[PDB]
Design an enzyme around this catalytic site. Structure first.
Site, short mmCIF file in Angstrom:
data_model
loop_
_atom_site.label_atom_id
_atom_site.label_comp_id
_atom_site.label_asym_id
_atom_site.label_seq_id
_atom_site.Cartn_x
_atom_site.Cartn_y
_atom_site.Cartn_z
N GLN A 49 -36.06 -30.97 114.62
CA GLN A 49 -35.66 -30.39 113.33
C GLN A 49 -36.05 -28.91 113.23
O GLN A 49 -35.47 -28.17 112.43
CB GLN A 49 -36.28 -31.17 112.17
N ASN A 108 -39.44 -40.13 115.70
CA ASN A 108 -39.61 -38.89 114.94
C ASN A 108 -38.59 -37.84 115.39
O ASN A 108 -37.81 -38.08 116.31
CB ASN A 108 -41.05 -38.36 115.08
N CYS A 129 -36.11 -33.62 107.92
CA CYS A 129 -36.50 -34.91 108.48
C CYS A 129 -35.67 -36.05 107.89
O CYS A 129 -35.28 -36.99 108.59
CB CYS A 129 -37.99 -35.16 108.23
N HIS A 184 -42.68 -37.04 104.73
CA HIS A 184 -41.95 -36.97 105.98
C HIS A 184 -41.11 -38.23 106.16
O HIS A 184 -41.57 -39.34 105.89
CB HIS A 184 -42.94 -36.81 107.14
#
Ligand SMILES: CC(=O)N[C@@H]1[C@@H](O[C@@H]2O[C@@H](C(=O)O)[C@@H](O[C@@H]3O[C@H](CO)[C@H](OS(=O)(=O)O)[C@H](O[C@@H]4O[C@@H](C(=O)O)[C@@H](O[C@@H]5O[C@H](CO)[C@H](OS(=O)(=O)O)[C@H](O[C@@H]6O[C@@H](C(=O)O)[C@@H](O)[C@H](O)[C@H]6O)[C@H]5NC(C)=O)[C@H](O)[C@H]4O)[C@H]3NC(C)=O)[C@H](O)[C@H]2O)[C@@H](OS(=O)(=O)O)[C@@H](CO)O[C@H]1O
Length: 215
Positions: free
Chosen positions: A19, A182, A25, A162
Site C-alpha cells: 500500500q 497484510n 489498507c 488497520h
C-alpha cells in the site's frame, strides 16, 4: 467447519501487495475478498484494483481511511471493479478513472459478521472464503512481527486502525490462530503474512468489523 482452512492452497489468494504510505489498507482488504470470491465463482485468479476504490469510493476518505462495507457497495452500484492492470496502484489520491472496459469483477452486495463473534467469523471463513477484517495494528510488536501466533496484551480490540484479509485459520503447536494477509509488502512479517491469536477473547478486535462481498 473443518479444523483447518487455508485458501492460499485452494488457489483463492493473490500475492502480497504494498500500500506504501497511503491509508488504503481497506482497499486491499476489500480487493482481496473480491479476488477470493471471483476465483470461487469463475475459477480465475486475478489481481483487482485498490486504486479504483481509493479514487472512486466517495463513501470513504481515500488515503485517509475507509471501510470495506462501502467498497463492496460501490462496486455493486458501479456494476464493476477494474483489474489491477486496467487501473494500476499509485499510492496517492486521484480523480476517479474507472473504465468499464477494464472491468474484472462484480458484486451483489455484502454480509457482515456479528460483532465480536470469532466462532461466527470461523464459520464465515470456512463457508465463504477470504473475509475482510479490521484490527488494532498500532503496536510495536505488530510492526516487528516475524514468526509465531501473534499475541500482545496491550492490543486494544476497540482501536481498529488497520484493515487486513483473513485467508484461513488453524493451530500451531496448540496455539489457535487466524492466517492473515497484510498489504505492507513481502518484507514485512512472514512473507507479508501474520498469524494472529484466535479464540483468545477477540484479540486485536479481529471479529469486530468483519465482512465479505456477495457474488
Ligand atoms: C449458515 C447455514 O447455512 N446454517 C445456519 C444454521 O447453522 C450453523 O452453521 C451451520 C454452518 O453450515 O456453518 C452449521 O454447520 C454445522 O456446524 C457445526 C458446528 O459449527 C458442525 O461443524 S463443526 O463441528 O465445526 O465441524 C457441523 O459439522 C460437522 O462437523 C464434523 C462432525 O461430524 O462433527 C464433520 O464431520 C466429519 O467431517 C470430516 C471432514 O469434514 C470427515 O468427513 S470427510 O470430509 O472426511 O468425508 C468425517 O468423516 C467420516 O469418516 C468415516 C467415519 O469416520 O465413519 C465415514 O463415516 C465418512 O467418511 C465420514 O462420516 C466426518 N465425521 C462425522 C462424524 O461427521 C462435518 O463437517 C459435519 O458433520 C456443521 N454441519 C453442517 C450441516 O453445516 C452449524 O451447526 C450451525 O451452528 C443456524 O445458525 S446458528 O447460528 O447455529 O443458529 C441457523 C439459525 O437457526 O441459520 C442457518 O443459516
Amino acid at each position: 467447519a473443518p479444523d483447518s482452512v487455508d485458501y492460499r492452497k485452494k488457489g483463492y489468494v493473490t500475492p502480497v501487495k504494498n500500500q506504501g504510505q497511503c491509508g488504503s489498507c481497506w482497499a486491499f482488504s476489500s480487493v482481496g475478498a473480491l479476488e477470493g470470491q471471483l476465483k470461487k465463482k469463475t475459477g480465475k485468479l486475478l489481481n483487482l484494483s485498490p486504486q479504483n476504490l481509493v479514487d472512486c469510493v466517495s463513501e470513504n476518505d481515500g488515503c485517509g481511511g475507509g471501510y470495506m462495507t462501502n467498497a463492496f457497495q460501490y462496486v455493486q452500484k458501479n456494476r464493476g471493479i477494474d483489474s489491477e492492470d486496467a487501473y494500476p496502484y499509485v499510492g496517492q489520491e486521484e480523480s476517479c478513472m474507472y473504465n468499464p472496459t477494464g472491468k474484472a469483477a462484480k458484486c451483489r452486495g455484502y454480509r457482515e459478521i456479528p460483532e465480536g463473534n470469532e466462532k461466527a467469523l470461523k464459520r464465515a471463513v470456512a463457508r465463504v472464503g477470504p473475509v475482510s477484517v479490521a484490527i488494532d495494528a498500532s503496536l510495536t510488536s505488530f510492526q516487528f512481527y516475524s514468526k509465531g501466533v501473534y499475541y500482545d496484551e496491550s492490543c486494544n480490540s476497540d482501536n481498529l486502525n488497520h484493515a487486513v484479509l483473513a485467508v484461513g485459520y488453524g493451530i500451531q503447536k496448540g496455539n489457535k490462530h487466524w492466517i492473515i494477509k497484510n498489504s505492507w509488502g513481502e518484507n514485512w512479517g512472514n512473507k507479508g503474512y501474520i498469524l494472529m491469536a484466535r479464540n483468545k477473547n477477540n484479540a486485536c478486535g479481529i471479529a469486530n468489523l468483519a465482512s465479505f462481498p456477495k457474488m
